[PDB]
Amino acid sequence: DVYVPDEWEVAREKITMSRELGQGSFGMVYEGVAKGVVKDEPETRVAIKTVNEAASMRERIEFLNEASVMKEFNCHHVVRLLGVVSQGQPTLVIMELMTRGDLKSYLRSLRPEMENNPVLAPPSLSKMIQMAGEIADGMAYLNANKFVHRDLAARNCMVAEDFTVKIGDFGMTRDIYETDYYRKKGLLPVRWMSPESLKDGVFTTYSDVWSFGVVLWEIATLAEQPYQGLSNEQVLRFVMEGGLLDKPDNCPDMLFELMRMCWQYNPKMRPSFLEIISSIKEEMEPGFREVSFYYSEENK
Numbered sequence: 657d658v659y660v661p662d663e664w665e666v667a668r669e670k671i672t673m674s675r676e677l678g679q680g681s682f683g684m685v686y687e688g689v690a691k692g693v694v695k696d697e698p699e700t701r702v703a704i705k706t707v708n709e710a711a712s713m714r715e716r717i718e719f720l721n722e723a724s725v726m727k728e729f730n731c732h733h734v735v736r737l738l739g740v741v742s743q744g745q746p747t748l749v750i751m752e753l754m755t756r757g758d759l760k761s762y763l764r765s766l767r768p769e770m771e772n773n774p775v776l777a778p779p780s781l782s783k784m785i786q787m788a789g790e791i792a793d794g795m796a797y798l799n800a801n802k803f804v805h806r807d808l809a810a811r812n813c814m815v816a817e818d819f820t821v822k823i824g825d826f827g828m829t830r831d832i833y834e835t836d837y838y839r840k841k842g843l844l845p846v847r848w849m850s851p852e853s854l855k856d857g858v859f860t861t862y863s864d865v866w867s868f869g870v871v872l873w874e875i876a877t878l879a880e881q882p883y884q885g886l887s888n889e890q891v892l893r894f895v896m897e898g899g900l901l902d903k904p905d906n907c908p909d910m911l912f913e914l915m916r917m918c919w920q921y922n923p924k925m926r927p928s929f930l931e932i933i934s935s936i937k938e939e940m941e942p943g944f945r946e947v948s949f950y951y952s953e954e955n956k
């Protein structure tokens with residue numbers, strides 16, 4: 657296996673890194689500035705994925721080919737790959753910057769602090785619906801491109817500066833969420849998995865819809881752990897036997913009703929991501945018609 661440089665190659669001179677954001681799968685992720693990566697933008701604030709100085713050539717090749725999966729997507733609700741610096745070292749992958757980080761961390765940041773200070777009220781139905789439709793739009797685009805996500809969860813969704821939610825860069829493991837997985841024999845996100853995936857290990861767009869339902873439950877609970885009082889082994893049994901997550905405290909009816917459609921035991925009875933969008937399109941912000949996959953000419 658090798659990495660072939662292409663049209664995504666960017667001159668290192670156009671790149672500058674500043675704030676370290678945190679550890680990625682192959683090395684440190686930094687915030688920075690990239691020249692000439694976005695049309696009509698002389699400079700753009702970007703995320704820069706790097707490979708640690710010590711890493712082998714085999715590993716930096718894998719990092720490049722793995723990151724390269726993102727090259728085929730062009731969706732407003734999917735985090736964009738903007739360039740690659742494969743020539744010389746350090747090896748860089750230039751990504752769209754999502755200043756508010758992953759959705760699980762963003763939702764947890766909205767929890768009231770244990771102090772006597774004023775606090776912003778929990779997100780409104782309208783704000784939660786906006787998040788749902790953006791996530792469902794990114795997922796509808798990914799399904800239209802013949803992909804199955806297999807790890808749809810708030811931790812794999814990212815939040816932009818303007819609060820837009822997008823399907824995150826693939827395989828960006830935040831070590832803080834390692835307990836959201838369970839090895840049974842690969843490491844799997846059992847609390848987000850459909851009953852049919854828990855039985856045979858097969859994932860489809862219908863099991864992504866199931867996970868989307870768990871994502872809504874994460875938004876309504878501010879990312880509590882699904883099935884909190886149950887062990888990883890107990891979760892498998894409960895969900896395969898028809899068990900469901902409870903309606904969160906103060907969850908608006910419409911949002912729980914959407915969760916219930918996603919958690920129908922028979923995968924064929926769940927709605928598709930497009931049907932999900934159709935049902936909430938009237939609740940979306942004006943701009944949704946201009947940027948979404950749902951309203952684009954691509955949706956045929």
Ligand SMILES: COc1cc(OC2CCN(C)CC2)ccc1Nc1nccc(-c2c[nH]c3cnccc23)n1
Nearest residue numbers: 677678679680685687703752753754755756757828
């Ligand atoms: C200013 O950009 C950010 C601030 C940020 O920090 C948090 C949100 C802001 N508060 C104040 C502090 C906590 C988290 C993420 C980003 N961006 C961003 N974009 C795209 C990809 C990534 C990313 C990919 N793999 C990672 C591993 N580890 C951290 C970040 C990443 N990261």
Ligand SMILES: [Cl-]
Nearest residue numbers: 796928929930
């Ligand atoms: Cl769909």
